[PDB]
Amino acid sequence: MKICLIDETGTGDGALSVLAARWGLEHDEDNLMALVLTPEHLELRKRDEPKLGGIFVDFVGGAMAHRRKFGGGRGEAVAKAVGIKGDYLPDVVDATAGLGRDAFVLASVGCRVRMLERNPVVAALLDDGLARGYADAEIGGWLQERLQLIHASSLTALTDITPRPQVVYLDPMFPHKQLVKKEMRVFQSLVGPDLDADGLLEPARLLATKRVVVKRPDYAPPLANVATPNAVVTKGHRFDIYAGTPV
């Protein structure tokens, strides 16, 4: 995958070169987007719009820490969709991690989560945030065990995953046009619709032993057109619930 790789560390240790090779990233000097390695973290920027700033994955502060403390935890719409209740904290596989926002909530509530991200540039951002998150004196401990990243095809590896997770969560990039903030304008400018999203449902329902949860924006059709009477509705979107495959 092509993108403008920029080093703002000054160390000269070759860290960016290693990270690029690890995720199969190719430097593209005149690419519209740029992946920058700062002393603080790895961020994505929209070169033609400096005023927008850069976006990065941070489990320690910012929006993720705010949502952790104020979002409600087990009371979140996504927490209820996966079936979280009482002492029930299922193992989850998030086949469309993206920025890891939902995945972080689930891990924060007490779920053992395994994230998968096929997009190399997004995966690079997650890995960097995971590195920083693991190094946190407060959450670094449980984070390292409840939130881990895996690089593989969510269509082929979604079957070889072991041990089988009780729940599989899906939230593929839906073909949108409707963002309002910078954290999305920059990102959306990079990541486009997941053309094979519909193909995720089947392998997901096979992997999960209890439930498959699909986040869907309002009015969006169910994934793969497979209807379901079970769903948790929220503001601006819903979570379609499907039965998994008992062991």
UniProtKB/Swiss-Prot annotation:
Transcription regulation in keyword set: no
GO cellular component term, pick one: cytoplasm
Subcellular location: Cytoplasm
Coiled-coil ranges per UniProt: none
Record EC number: 2.1.1.242
Major enzyme class: transferase
Pfam families: SAM_MT
Reaction equation(s) it catalyzes: guanosine(1516) in 16S rRNA + S-adenosyl-L-methionine = N(2)-methylguanosine(1516) in 16S rRNA + S-adenosyl-L-homocysteine + H(+)
Annotated residues for binding of S-adenosyl-L-methionine: 101-102, 117-118, 153-154, 171
Molecular-function GO term, any one: rRNA (guanine-N2-)-methyltransferase activity
Protein name: Ribosomal RNA small subunit methyltransferase J
Keywords, sorted A to Z: Cytoplasm, Methyltransferase, rRNA processing, S-adenosyl-L-methionine, Transferase
PANTHER family documented for this protein: RIBOSOMAL RNA SMALL SUBUNIT METHYLTRANSFERASE J
Entry similarity comment: Belongs to the methyltransferase superfamily. RsmJ family.
Functional summary from the UniProt entry: Specifically methylates the guanosine in position 1516 of 16S rRNA.
